[PDB]
Amino acid sequence: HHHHHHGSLLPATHELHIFGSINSLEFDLVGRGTGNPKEGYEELHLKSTKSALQFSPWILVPQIFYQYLPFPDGAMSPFQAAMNDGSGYQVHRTMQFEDGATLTGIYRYTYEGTHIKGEFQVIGTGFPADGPVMTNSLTAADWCVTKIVYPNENTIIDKFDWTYTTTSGKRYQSNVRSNFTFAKPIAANILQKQPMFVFRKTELKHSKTELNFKEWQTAFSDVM
Amino acid sequence: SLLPATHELHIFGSINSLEFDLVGRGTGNPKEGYEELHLKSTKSALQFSPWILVPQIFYQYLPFPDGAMSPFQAAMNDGSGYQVHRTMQFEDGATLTGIYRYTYEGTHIKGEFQVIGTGFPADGPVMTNSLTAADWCVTKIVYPNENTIIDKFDWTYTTTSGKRYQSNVRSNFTFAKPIAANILQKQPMFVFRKTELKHSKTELNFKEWQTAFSDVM
Amino acid sequence: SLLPATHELHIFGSINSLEFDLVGRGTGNPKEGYEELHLKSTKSALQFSPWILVPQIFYQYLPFPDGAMSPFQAAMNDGSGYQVHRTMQFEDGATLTGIYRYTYEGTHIKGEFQVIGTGFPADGPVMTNSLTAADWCVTKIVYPNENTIIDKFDWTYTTTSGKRYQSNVRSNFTFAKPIAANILQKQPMFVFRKTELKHSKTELNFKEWQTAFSDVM
Amino acid sequence: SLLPATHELHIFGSINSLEFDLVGRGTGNPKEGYEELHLKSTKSALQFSPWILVPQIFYQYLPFPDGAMSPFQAAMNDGSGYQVHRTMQFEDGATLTGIYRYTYEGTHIKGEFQVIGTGFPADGPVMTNSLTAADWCVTKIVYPNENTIIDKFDWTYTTTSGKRYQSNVRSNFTFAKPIAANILQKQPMFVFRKTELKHSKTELNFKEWQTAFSDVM
Predict the structure, then answer these.
(1) Which of A158, B77, C111, D75 could lock onto C9 through a cystine, CB 3.0 to 4.6 A?
(2) Residue among C99, C122, C176 minimizing CB distance to D116
């Protein structure tokens, strides 16, 4: 899109400001990343602007860019099409954990050419003081299949069952739904591609002040 | 014991990305669980049912039984306060989150409430302004630890079509100071609430009656 | 107006594939909302908390306010009856389904309840016999149509560890004949219930009190 | 070494209290995740969409990647077996519970599946036979302990109106003997399934293809 950029306008770089609180404990992180929007790969570095995180940095995954996700056959995903034409979308995600904790993420983006700027507000509450989030006991996130559905032409809901492994070997579960609101209607040729799934893998290296994150995503309508 | 007499609210956010922003003042009786609030839009008319802001639009006015302070009142009394994070999941897949923060000046409360609602169908009763009232409701309160309250309720509106419009609601309250042992010992606690809302396109006049109970037998 | 005075129950099924089967009789007071029931296992010791069978173990004892019949009593009264399909979804992922069917012999009720539960952790409070009591509870009754009711409640037990053990419960009632209009219009309706269970591994002695209410103010 | 070649099903229960009973026979290919089944009503015409019996109507035909026995196959191979308790919660409030029990005789499976469904609106697509197909589906499998599998999937039908009809499904499997440790170390496991159904009101002809996968990349 754009008189001096004739191809699709897909992301090459991003930056994130993520902030909010977990059990009223305030956090704020900023950082920059890159990725490959033809392969569904992204990576991001973050650093606290407020000293050490008093909870598992893994509770920020998957809060920490579907603009890097292509659809099959080199097609644009609806996320990519909304960045391509400047119209955009918003996200409102809610995670509901097996221990009654809730985590809401509110994601907003602006775009400058192939660079994305994210402002994500995240609020989590009701994490038990001896549970794995507050004791920093999460070790990894399981690989995950999300299903994409379209309640109308301007909305997507994605849905997934999200599980971490913990230092004890036990899993820690939540139900996640993400409501996407698009400023412009999603193209009919995307809407007809149902059902659609996305396989995702994440990695995270962290200290108490810094995060180094990676995600691979692959959309698929079949395996067989 | 310093209980509230007056309040003000700045409530803002969006419903299906449509932004709103309202400000106003109210009063209430913390010995009887009554409050009333007027709000006015700082933009234009709301582009959705004003009823979707109920019960977003002050447990500081709720006494506990036999004249005791509720934990919400105790937290105001000593200034330590609490936060609210509320999530409503509707039958049609919509989600509404409310994030409530307060400051206190003597017997005056100032509320800053952020509300984000998404996934309301364009032909549903929220977006077509077809909600007519909110059913009276019983909330259940438990205390999972000395700093945390979880309340839960099934929230239903009546609509012009006669079909009720339902959501399941959970509210997580986070307290800066521990809640009194003697409060913690009485679980669960229930609260019976009635609401009223009169509105124009730009102004809302809201009332709420709330009464806590352990038993009705 | 032929209200219940006695009942009997055969309740059977399995918990995590462990079969159980109990039988026994009871009495109650359908003007007071009281019932008691004594059950004995027909398959020796229960291999799980007997409290997981509460509230599986008779809304025909529930009057509505001012001496009115509840819809459940009315359906006994005229013989037409109703069926129940209840699902409880627990915080630890376990699911318990109950299927309740009744026949009537004058003022006597005969129940056949099938109950299947799975997914209870081996180290959770049901399988370790660590439930200590069931919290008092308010249920909400709604009517999707003239021959169905849905009831909903947040069910919690206390346990020996101090941590409550929670589930969301929904009960779908299917009535053979339409529920009277004068009942349908009393919405919303709530019921306050209290239960007691004294037990061994083979014998359960249960009591329940229930009181319908439209308001508390 | 022993995998199924044939199966028979007796599936029975009720939808909105309307009783149904079907019986029939099928085959499949357990090296490839394929099965087909024919069913005929033993009572009258089905009083609701036959598609609501999909996926009630055999993971013993599912291999795991690389010519592995699934744990479902291993349990048939050694005769120890497993039971299934499935709950579907639909977007309109309906609930459908399935309870599946099997016996084996050589390479033949005999299933006895009890299905109870309630809460389907009179005007909804199940009761108006408005379901047209089931979307292709990915299920997630996890193993909470060595005797239990939980599977989970979002199940959607297409309908004559064009609006999909959605439910959240969970299935709890209880195994009589422990699942092998090598199987337990690989989770989550996913399964891609495709179904077909041709039907009248009295007869169903069903096909399913299933492929387990740990990755797609």
Answers:
(1) C111
(2) C99
